[PDB]
Amino acid sequence: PEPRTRRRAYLWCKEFLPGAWRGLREDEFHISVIRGGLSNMLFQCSLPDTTATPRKVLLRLYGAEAMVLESVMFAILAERSLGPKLYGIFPQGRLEQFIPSRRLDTEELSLPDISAEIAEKMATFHGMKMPFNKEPKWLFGTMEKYLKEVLRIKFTEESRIKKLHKLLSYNLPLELENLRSLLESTPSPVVFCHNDCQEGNILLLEGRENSEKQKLMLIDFEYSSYNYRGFDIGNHFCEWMYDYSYEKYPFFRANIRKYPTKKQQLHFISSYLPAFQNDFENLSTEEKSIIKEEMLLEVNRFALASHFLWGLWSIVQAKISSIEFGYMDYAQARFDAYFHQKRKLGV
Ligand SMILES: Cc1csc(NC(=O)[C@H]2CC[C@@H](n3cnc4c(N)nc(Cl)nc43)CC2)n1
Ligand SMILES: [Mg+2]
Numbered sequence: 001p002e003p004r005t006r007r008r009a010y011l012w013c014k015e016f017l018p019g020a021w022r023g024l025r026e027d028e029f030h031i032s033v034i035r036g037g038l039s040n041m042l043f044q045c046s047l048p049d050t051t052a053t054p055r056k057v058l059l060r061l062y063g064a065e066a067m068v069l070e071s072v073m074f075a076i077l078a079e080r081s082l083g084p085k086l087y088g089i090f091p092q093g094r095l096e097q098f099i100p101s102r103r104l105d106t107e108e109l110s111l112p113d114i115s116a117e118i119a120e121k122m123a124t125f126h127g128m129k130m131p132f133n134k135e136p137k138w139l140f141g142t143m144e145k146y147l148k149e150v151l152r153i154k155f156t157e158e159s160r161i162k163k164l165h166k167l168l169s170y171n172l173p174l175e176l177e178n179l180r181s182l183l184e185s186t187p188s189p190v191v192f193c194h195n196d197c198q199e200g201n202i203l204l205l206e207g208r209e210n211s212e213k214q215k216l217m218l219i220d221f222e223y224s225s226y227n228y229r230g231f232d233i234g235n236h237f238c239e240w241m242y243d244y245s246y247e248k249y250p251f252f253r254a255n256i257r258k259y260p261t262k263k264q265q266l267h268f269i270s271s272y273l274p275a276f277q278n279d280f281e282n283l284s285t286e287e288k289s290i291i292k293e294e295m296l297l298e299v300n301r302f303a304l305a306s307h308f309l310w311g312l313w314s315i316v317q318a319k320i321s322s323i324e325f326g327y328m329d330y331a332q333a334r335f336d337a338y339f340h341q342k343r344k345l346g347v
Pocket of ligand 1: 032033034035044058084096097098099100101102103203219220
């Protein structure tokens with residue numbers, strides 16, 4: 001961090017944080033990076049070990065309408081103990097509780113205890129009443145948004161042109177309508193969705209590793225909105241196939257075989273349903289199975305919208321992102337998986 005901003009950070013923490021931060025000099029202010037990106041940047045600010053009395057906070061610099069919303073949403077989830085505590089909010093960013101933890105790894109998503117908890121937390125999130133638009137316009141609204149951007153994009157480099165040409169050759173505008181007809185035919189309750197429920201957005205809390213049902217916290221609610229519940233679950237299933245930790249180009253690995261098996265999907269929803277609908281436990285065996293089977297159809301259909309949306313999203317990112325990542329390859333992997341899924345489903 002360039003030392004000019006190492007100043008601002010100091011002030012933000014001097015002004016906004018209580019106790020020993022109030023009477024802190026600039027010569028005792030440690031702040032390391034946590035993640036660059038020139039957008040939604042994260043830093044760890046802390047005291048010297050020498051200063052008696054929180055000792056560590058996270059600072060989030062925004063970088064690049066939706067600012068009002070994100071802020072209220074974060075504040076609400078903090079108030080309700082569903083998110084990190086909010087300690088300071090300003091134009092450039094916010095100071096948040098630092099949660100001692102690590103992000104999950106992809107392989108961990110399939111661990112029965114982890115899956116069960118993720119299902120529980122998503123269910124809780126889905127139960128939240130939030131002060132936002134309750135109409136489910138997000139999913140197609142966003143896909144149309146990205147689609148229009150996609151059709152406008154021109155790349156100078158030659159292989160990017162060929163990659164894009166291959167993607168445009170699927171006839172994306174017609175394929176979107178194909179998905180619309182399928183998804184408008186597939187009922188799914190509208191709820192407050194995380195919309196980006198990937199391993200990277202799930203913290204395993206330090207010293208709770210032994211807890212069976214209470215070791216996780218969903219974070220990063222950048223894409224959260226009222227949306228079809230099938231999207232949140234289908235999208236999460238899809239994330240079983242993608243590992244963003246790979247250290248070589250394109251900086252992800254995709255594995256269609258790691259998509260949850262029927263059994264793994266039933267285990268997830270088995271834990272989702274009681275958590276979401278409290279009386280669910282008390283239905284007949286017959287009735288539970290009906291709901292489960294319907295739910296498998298629903299989530300596996302919406303899974304198609306996860307490939308499609310993130311596919312489009314990734315083409316745009318290839319134009320405009322500063323992040324070192326193989327977007328065009330990722331987009332192609334999402335479309336591969338999209339068609340593979342349509343084939344598996346007979347749609
Ligand atoms: C150099 C360095 C020191 S620590 C670090 N990375 C990490 O600790 C991981 C795991 C914890 C995670 N984290 C903890 N609190 C939060 C929070 N409030 N919001 C978000 Cl979005 N993430 C949070 C950050 C990413 N890098
Ligand atoms: Mg993943």
